[PDB]
Amino acid sequence: MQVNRLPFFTNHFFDTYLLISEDTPVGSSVTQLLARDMDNDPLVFGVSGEEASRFFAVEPDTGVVWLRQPLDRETKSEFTVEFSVSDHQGVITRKVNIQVGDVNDNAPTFHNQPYSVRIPENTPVGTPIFIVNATDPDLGAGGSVLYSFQPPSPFFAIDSARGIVTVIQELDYEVTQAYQLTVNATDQDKTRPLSTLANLAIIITDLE
Ligand SMILES: [Ca+2]
Ligand SMILES: [Ca+2]
Ligand SMILES: [Ca+2]
Ligand SMILES: [Ca+2]
Ligand SMILES: [Cl-]
Ligand SMILES: [K+]
Ligand SMILES: [K+]
Ligand SMILES: [K+]
Ligand SMILES: [K+]
Numbered sequence: 001m002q003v004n005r006l007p008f009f010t011n012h013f014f015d016t017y018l019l020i021s022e023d024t025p026v027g028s029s030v031t032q033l034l035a036r037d038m039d040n041d042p043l044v045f046g047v048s049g050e051e052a053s054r055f056f057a058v059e060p061d062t063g064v065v066w067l068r069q070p071l072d073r074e075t076k077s078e079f080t081v082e083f084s085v086s087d088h089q090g091v092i093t094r095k096v097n098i099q100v101g102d103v104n105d106n107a108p109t110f111h112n113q114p115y116s117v118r119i120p121e122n123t124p125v126g127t128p129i130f131i132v133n134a135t136d137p138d139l140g141a142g143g144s145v146l147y148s149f150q151p152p153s154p155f156f157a158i159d160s161a162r163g164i165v166t167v168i169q170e171l172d173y174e175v176t177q178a179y180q181l182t183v184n185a186t187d188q189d190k191t192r193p194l195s196t197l198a199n200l201a202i203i204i205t206d207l208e
Pocket of ligand 8: 135136137138143144
């Protein structure tokens, strides 16, 4: 006698992974489930799991997988999602790794503010006095930060890659007792670069 033949998935992505860009708009098709049933039985498709079912939805008859909630690679960069296909006699399931693709959607962040440092007026030229860091969680160029002063300073320099602030001209407590500088931290995305400003207070102390 014949036993029912269960359906099986035919998507090539099950053996590797699915890529979905984090800026994919809700409602978008992210893929279409494909399956075969050698009895030519009508098939129904789904997704299961609390988390998977929250972010993704499946058209039961077409197997089109939709995006149901916005993604954010910086919050969750991948999913293991279980999809199902059924001929109404049995349910077959397979898991797929879904990678969330990066876009540059974060500006750098400065931590441990406010930034202030006290130095003596005889601190010599070339003396490193402060190290700035801004974090950027994006990937590649979009996560690589460069530093500068805006506007520039004739008394202080900041190393662009390293954020090391140095004295570049002799100081003088009587001429200037304090400097308020502005640090620009910008990522290096080619098309959409993002940047952030932080205040740096430099206080000059008197020897006498
Ligand atoms: Ca069947
Ligand atoms: Ca994001
Ligand atoms: Ca990102
Ligand atoms: Ca960035
Ligand atoms: Cl299968
Ligand atoms: K479901
Ligand atoms: K750094
Ligand atoms: K980074
Ligand atoms: K003095």
